[PDB]
Amino acid sequence: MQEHYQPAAIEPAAQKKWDDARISNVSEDASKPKYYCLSMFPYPSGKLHMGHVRNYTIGDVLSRFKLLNGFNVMQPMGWDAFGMPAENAAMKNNVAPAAWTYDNIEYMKTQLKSLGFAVDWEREVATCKPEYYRWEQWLFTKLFEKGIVYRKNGTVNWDPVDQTVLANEQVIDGRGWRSGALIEKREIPMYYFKITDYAEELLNDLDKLEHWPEQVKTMQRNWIGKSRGMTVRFAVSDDSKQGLEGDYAKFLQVYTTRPDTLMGATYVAVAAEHPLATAAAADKPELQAFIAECKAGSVAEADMATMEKKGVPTGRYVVNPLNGDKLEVWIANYVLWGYGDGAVMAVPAHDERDFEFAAKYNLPKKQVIAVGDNAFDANRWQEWYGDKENGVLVNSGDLDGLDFQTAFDAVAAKLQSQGAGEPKTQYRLRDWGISRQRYWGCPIPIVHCEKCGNVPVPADQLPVVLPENVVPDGMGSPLAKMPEFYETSCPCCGGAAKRETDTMDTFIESSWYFFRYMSPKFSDGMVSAESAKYWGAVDQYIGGIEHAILHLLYARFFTKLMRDEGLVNVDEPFERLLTQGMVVCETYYDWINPADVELDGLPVVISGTEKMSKSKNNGVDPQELINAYGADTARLFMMFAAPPEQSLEWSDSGVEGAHRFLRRLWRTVYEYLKQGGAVKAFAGNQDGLSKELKDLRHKLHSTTAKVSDDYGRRQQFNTAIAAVMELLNQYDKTDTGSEQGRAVAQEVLEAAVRLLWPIVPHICETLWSELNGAKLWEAGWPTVDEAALVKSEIEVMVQVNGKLRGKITVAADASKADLEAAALANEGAVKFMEGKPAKKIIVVPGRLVNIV
Numbered sequence: 079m080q081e082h083y084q085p086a087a088i089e090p091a092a093q094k095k096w097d098d099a100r101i102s103n104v105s106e107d108a109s110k111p112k113y114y115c116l117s118m119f120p121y122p123s124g125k126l127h128m129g130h131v132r133n134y135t136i137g138d139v140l141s142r143f144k145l146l147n148g149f150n151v152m153q154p155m156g157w158d159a160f161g162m163p164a165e166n167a168a169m170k171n172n173v174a175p176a177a178w179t180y181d182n183i184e185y186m187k188t189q190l191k192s193l194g195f196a197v198d199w200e201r202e203v204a205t206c207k208p209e210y211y212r213w214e215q216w217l218f219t220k221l222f223e224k225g226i227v228y229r230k231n232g233t234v235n236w237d238p239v240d241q242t243v244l245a246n247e248q249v250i251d252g253r254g255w256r257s258g259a260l261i262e263k264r265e266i267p268m269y270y271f272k273i274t275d276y277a278e279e280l281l282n283d284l285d286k287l288e289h290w291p292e293q294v295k296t297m298q299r300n301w302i303g304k305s306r307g308m309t310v311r312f313a314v315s316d317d318s319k320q321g322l323e324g325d326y327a328k329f330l331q332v333y334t335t336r337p338d339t340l341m342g343a344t345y346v347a348v349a350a351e352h353p354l355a356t357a358a359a360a361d362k363p364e365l366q367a368f369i370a371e372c373k374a375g376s377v378a379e380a381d382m383a384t385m386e387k388k389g390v391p392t393g394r395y396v397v398n399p400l401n402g403d404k405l406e407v408w409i410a411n412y413v414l415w416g417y418g419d420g421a422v423m424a425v426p427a428h429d430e431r432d433f434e435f436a437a438k439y440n441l442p443k444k445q446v447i448a449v450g451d452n453a454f455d456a457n458r459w460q461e462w463y464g465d466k467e468n469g470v471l472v473n474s475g476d477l478d479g480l481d482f483q484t485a486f487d488a489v490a491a492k493l494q495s496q497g498a499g500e501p502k503t504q505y506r507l508r509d510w511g512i513s514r515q516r517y518w519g520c521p522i523p524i525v526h527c528e529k530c531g532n533v534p535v536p537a538d539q540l541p542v543v544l545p546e547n548v549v550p551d552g553m554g555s556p557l558a559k560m561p562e563f564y565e566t567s568c569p570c571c572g573g574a575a576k577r578e579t580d581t582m583d584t585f586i587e588s589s590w591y592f593f594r595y596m597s598p599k600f601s602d603g604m605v606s607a608e609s610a611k612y613w614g615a616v617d618q619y620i621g622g623i624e625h626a627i628l629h630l631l632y633a634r635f636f637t638k639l640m641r642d643e644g645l646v647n648v649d650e651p652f653e654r655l656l657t658q659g660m661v662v663c664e665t666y667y668d669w670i671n672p673a674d675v676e677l678d679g680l681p682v683v684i685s686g687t688e689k690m691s692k693s694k695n696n697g698v699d700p701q702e703l704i705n706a707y708g709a710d711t712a713r714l715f716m717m718f719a720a721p722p723e724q725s726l727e728w729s730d731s732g733v734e735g736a737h738r739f740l741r742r743l744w745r746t747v748y749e750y751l752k753q754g755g756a757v758k759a760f761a762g763n764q765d766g767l768s769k770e771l772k773d774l775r776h777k778l779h780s781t782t783a784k785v786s787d788d789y790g791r792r793q794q795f796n797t798a799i800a801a802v803m804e805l806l807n808q809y810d811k812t813d814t815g816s817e818q819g820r821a822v823a824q825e826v827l828e829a830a831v832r833l834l835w836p837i838v839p840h841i842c843e844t845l846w847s848e849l850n851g852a853k854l855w856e857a858g859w860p861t862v863d864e865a866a867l868v869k870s871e872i873e874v875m876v877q878v879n880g881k882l883r884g885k886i887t888v889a890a891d892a893s894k895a896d897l898e899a900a901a902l903a904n905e906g907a908v909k910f911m912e913g914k915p916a917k918k919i920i921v922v923p924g925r926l927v928n929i930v
């Protein structure tokens with residue numbers, strides 16, 4: 079054994095040993111319990127950095143722990159390869175997105191190999207390959223014929239100068255980002271998933287997820303946004319019917335989640351496009367100007383809560399079906415058209431938005447809810463004005479005195495009796511828009527035929543292959559300029575037709591890739607039946623909180639869709655979820671990378687500390703750290719600097735500390751083997767061992783219990799490492815030179831290197847092979863010796879009134895109440911008490927009990 083730790087030598091040799099043994103290339107082995115551990119797969123956008131590395135190190139730690147405990151572990155890796163990264167590089171470096179992507183994949187794959195993650199590379203997928211995306215095309219066509227995928231007109235941002243569709247994130251202040259031209263709202267046919275048909279299932283199945291962070295479940299619930307409410311119709315007053323045609327001539331319909339306050343309604347508000355607004359804006363140019371200002375604002379919810387809420391009265395009136403009140407209709411800019419009825423009632427006394435609107439225009443406030451004895455000034459708003467759980471109805475006639483749910487059901491009964499309303503469930507969830515007017519994405523498997531319509535491509539003809547020899551330039555979708563792509567024949571009638579040239583939202587690839595890893599070469603379906611049955615669901619998913627809503631909701635949706643298609647038999651894709659904290663790093667600037675600065679030879683300006691990312695160019699390349707210190711130093715530093723969920727500050731001094739600890743561990747094993755070579759590790763009955771060696775074994779086995787619980791239950795790796803460090807401090811303070819000393823030392827060292835192998839497997843593999851000839855992964859996770867934890871019993875003096883009357887043998891863990899009990903039953907005490915009770919019993923732990 080070499081004296082000094084050389085990671086540049088031992089880390090390649092350890093990786094070759096694992097690769098050659100194929101320990102991470104797994105099959106559907108029924109004779110082994112499965113464990114599927116998944117980290118969110120990266121975009122192949124150029125280089126991984128230490129942030130990605132923390133995520134994948136967490137996943138590898140968990141995989142290697144399960145591997146040591148006998149599991150058949152699948153830890154797969156792949157490339158989320160479609161999307162806007164490569165298209166933007168295509169406009170920059172004037173290169174094809176495919177070539178840019180495959181080159182980043184090659185570079186990034188070697189980044190991962192050199193960190194030594196226990197990954198089944200035979201299961202690698204790249205989502206931009208036909209062998210992959212043909213199956214999301216297949217599922218698309220199967221859902222399209224069921225109506226689960228459908229075609230309908232939707233709104234898009236059309237940039238008239240750049241001649242392309244823009245994402246909302248690229249429309250700044252009404253105009254295009256890279257052009258400043260005023261953006262047009264256009265209606266174009268697009269494709270949607272009818273995810274609203276699964277809202278209740280997607281909401282209710284969250285309850286099954288007993289091992290998810292409650293915050294992630296809460297965010298999904300809020301996104302789905304189910305509400306139980308009440309449709310309510312207000313009769314159009316007789317003087318207010320001009321210009322109105324149809325049912326709009328008879329009533330104004332709204333949805334409320336507070337029908338228990340319908341008696342508190344003092345006006346009603348309609349959207350600018352509501353037929354009452356347009357009818358009242360007939361002879362009214364100011365209503366016309368308000369309606370126009372509305373249509374030119376941003377309906378995005380981000381602007382909505384941060385916008386000043388305005389309105390104009392319409393001179394039209396409707397009637398409250400409960401108390402007969404005539405209420406004016408207002409046009410208001412916060413009421414959205416297309417979101418249900420496009421009209422709301424307003425109860426200013428019990429809804430904050432309505433209170434501010436009514437305080438602006440001096441509209442009435444009518445109290446219908448009292449929360450206890452609380453004071454109500456119609457002038458100030460109070461948090462309890464909206465209290466739904468502790469209020470009771472006032473000024474409501476028949477309904478005086480009921481709580482929220484009772485009044486809700488009573489209003490339901492009264493309104494249905496009058497045909498004026500009915501219960502109704504709504505969701506804020508909208509359908510999922512698939513269409514993207516972009517080149518670098520999965521083609522939509524639809525052919526447009528003038529006689530047949532929108533025809534799905536037959537399964538035999540899938541995939542619809544995306545041509546890779548394309549260099550986009552942002553001048554609109556290149557697929558729409560390639561007749562050799564879009565010109566085709568109709569699959570139904572054989573006539574001339576045209577392919578759809580839009581491509582799919584790239585969230586579609588990440589919505590089922592975790593099933594594809596189960597059989598990434600299956601040619602007859604998305605996932606084979608045999609492998610889906612074996613691997614079941616993902617046991618452990620690790621990714622950042624930025625994907626806690628859309629990505630996770632989409633994946634759960636696809637799982638149900640695939641289950642409904644008969645392809646898998648789980649309801650939920652991910653059993654456990656770990657949301658790792660962000661690695662953050664100081665930035666510098668024209669943004670300069672930390673590895674190229676020092677504190678041209680000229681200085682830079684040192685700016686703030688933020689999430690590591692290419693946006694501010696503050697990603698530390700792991701290859702730089704590995705060349706300097708080794709993969710194990712990088713892994714150890716990540717796992718030790720912070721609990722995995724807390725943010726982690728990049729730190730030069732943290733890297734050095736990790737490296738010193740690995741030199742320490744190397745030194746410990748070398749100095750041990752220097753003093754006499756490997757022996758059989760201590761095992762069995764420890765009677766006869768010296769106190770110091772018993773104490774070292776107690777430390778050892780309690781360290782084994784605490785590490786197993788930190789990896790397995792707590793998933794807190796920093797404290798597991800800190801625990802192994804304490805064992806070595808105890809070790810260092812123990813004279814292990816005797817024959818029994820060497821055997822305990824061997825036991826300690828054999829346990830430490832296995833306990834740390836999930837964190838730093840290169841050094842631990844190497845040290846283990848110097849200690850013990852067996853394969854580390856067949857020796858398995860260290861076991862806890864319960865006897866090693868039993869401390870020694872102590873003898874206690876039993877005094878009756880201060881005079882010694884006996885002795886008791888008591889356990890080292892014994893409480894004051896056990897001592898009191900054992901003392902009271904001692905034959906010598908019981909005799910010298912003469913049936914008299916105790917006035918007091920003084921317990922001195924470890925020394926004496928004195929009965930008064």
Ligand SMILES: CC(C)C[C@H](N)C(=O)NS(=O)(=O)OC[C@H]1O[C@@H](n2cnc3c(N)ncnc32)[C@H](O)[C@@H]1O
Nearest residue numbers: 118119120121129130133158588621622660661690
């Ligand atoms: C399933 C699919 C939608 C995933 C999608 N392809 C994707 O997001 N790819 S990715 O390359 O941006 O990120 C991959 C993982 O790496 C984490 N990560 C990134 N930066 C940091 C950081 N500074 N600190 C810590 N972790 C970080 C990040 O959260 C994610 O889990």
Ligand SMILES: [Mg+2]
Nearest residue numbers: 285286287288
């Ligand atoms: Mg359960």
Ligand SMILES: [Zn+2]
Nearest residue numbers: 527530568571
């Ligand atoms: Zn046809």
